[PDB]
Amino acid sequence: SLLPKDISQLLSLVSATINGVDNPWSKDQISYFRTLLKVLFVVLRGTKHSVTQLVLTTLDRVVARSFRNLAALVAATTPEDLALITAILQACLSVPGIEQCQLQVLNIMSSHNVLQVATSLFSWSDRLAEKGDPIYGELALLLLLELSALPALAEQLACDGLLGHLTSANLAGFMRRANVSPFTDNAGAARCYAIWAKGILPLLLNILGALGATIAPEVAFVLNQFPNLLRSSVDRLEAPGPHYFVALVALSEVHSLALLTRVLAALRSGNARDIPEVVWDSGAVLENVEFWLASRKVLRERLLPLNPREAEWRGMKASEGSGCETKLEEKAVGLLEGIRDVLA
């Protein structure tokens, strides 16, 4: 064989190279494996075709197998190794040609332990991360979340009672404490919010891939066991005049909840199965949204980036059809503008 000239031949060579590594995650050569995975991630993101069999071969031999090993708390491995694996999964599922072979992924995943152990890890988190924050809590859900974008795998989680494990977990008591907020001096509460906003809620939006005829009483019951959050989500976006700033995640949380409560309501009018009502004042949200839409100046002043990624497109700019000055504002505008459409 010659040198790789195609992006697919590069993918073959990198993947052929990953399998060659005798003992991954071993104290010696764990660091070399770490950058191989990073090379894989670059190539996979590079697969915009700017071939699909390799990606499916990668999902078993690389992604599934590695997570199985990551339950090692005996070993030079870190949370960021899991995050790297979660990342490689995203790159795989973004490649053109995938999403037609979802049962394939379902097949591949279910073969290993995976979501069973991913769920296990979620119920573990606090005993395994009270350095300050349940770091493995968010990592587990984000793994599940990425998979839940595939409707078939979404059905498996609910059938295996993921929503049951979510509320029964020890974590459910920490998220329930009234200190959970994106702007906390506490590391735990800050991660608790991350698990709920960036994990639980987008999970629920996807689990309703089974049309919400079923699971709707279960998704409504999940939300119903975090009322301090349903209450906080509205108060956080309150027009200026115990909250100083406003985050982008706060807008997506409310965006998620607005979709859930509306879809649930369009399923409650079915009058055919008991879908519990969820206490979430839509009225306050709408008004809060309008008095942030009509004030781009006071918006960009109070709006703060929380992630190094979000800060990138904060100092950036994207005018086009201009109602915003910076790109971060545009994304901020985009979110709460959709919340207006939904609740209407």
Numbering used by the authors: 1445 to 1494, 1510 to 1533, 1538 to 1704, 1721 to 1823
Task: Give sentences from the paper.
Nucleocytoplasmic transport across the nuclear envelope is controlled and facilitated by nuclear pore complexes (NPCs), very large, modular protein assemblies. The Nic96 complex organizes four architectural proteins, Nic96, Nup157/170, Nup188, and Nup192, as well as the more disordered protein Nup53/59. Nup188 is a stacked helical protein with intrinsic flexibility. Moreover, we can show that both Nup188 and Nup192 specifically bind to FG-repeats and translocate across NPCs by facilitated diffusion.
Nup188C crystallized in space group P212121 with two copies per asymmetric unit. The C-terminal fragment of Nup188, Nup188C, is a right-handed arc-shaped superhelical structure built from 19 helices that form 6 helical repeats, which are stacked in regular order. The first helical pair (α1 and α2) forms a HEAT repeat followed by 5 ARM repeats. The inner face of the structure is built from helices α2, α5, α8, α12, α15, and α19. The C-terminal helix α19 caps the structure. At the N terminus, helices α1 and α2 expose a hydrophobic surface, which strongly suggests that the full-length protein continues in a stacked pattern. This hydrophobic surface engages in a twofold symmetric crystal packing contact with a neighboring Nup188C molecule resulting in a horseshoe-shaped dimer. Because this contact is generated by a protein truncation, we suggest that it is a crystal artifact and not physiologically relevant.
